[PDB]
Ligand binder design. Sequence first.
Ligand SMILES: CC(=O)c1cc(-c2ccccc2CO)c2cc(Oc3ccccc3)ccn12
Length: 116
Amino acid sequence: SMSVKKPKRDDSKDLALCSMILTEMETHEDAWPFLLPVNLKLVPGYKKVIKKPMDFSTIREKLSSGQYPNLETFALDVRLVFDNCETFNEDDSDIGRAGHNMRKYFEKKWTDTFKV
Ligand SMILES: CC(=O)c1cc(-c2ccccc2CO)c2cc(Oc3ccccc3)ccn12
C-alpha cells in the first residue's frame, strides 16, 4: 500500500528471456501453423469465430517494439495462439496436434525459465 513496498522479483532479464523462448517456439518443427497470421481471406469463418487472432510473427513484432508491459502480457499472447487453435481446429487434425504440442513446449520453457 502507500509507502509500503513489497518485495518484487528481478525483471531485468525478462525481455531477453521471453525473446529466447519465442526463438525456440519459432524454430520448432510444429510451429508451422503459427508463424504468420491465419490468412483471413483464405480460411472461411476465422475472422468471425476467432475474435483476437494471434501468431508468433505478431508476438515477435510486439516484443521488438515495447508493446509488452511485462512478461505476463507476453505469456497471455502466446497462450492466445494456442487457445485460438483449440477453438478452431479439431484435436485430431495436424494443426490441432501441433497446437497441443507447442503449448506443452511453451509451458515447460515458461516454468523452467521463470518459476525459480
Ligand atoms: C493456426 C490455425 O488455425 C491455422 C493455420 C493455418 C495455416 C497453416 C499453414 C499455412 C497457412 C494457413 C492459413 O493461413 C490454417 C488453415 C486452416 O484452414 C485451411 C486448411 C487447409 C487449406 C486451407 C485452409 C485452418 C486453420 N489454420
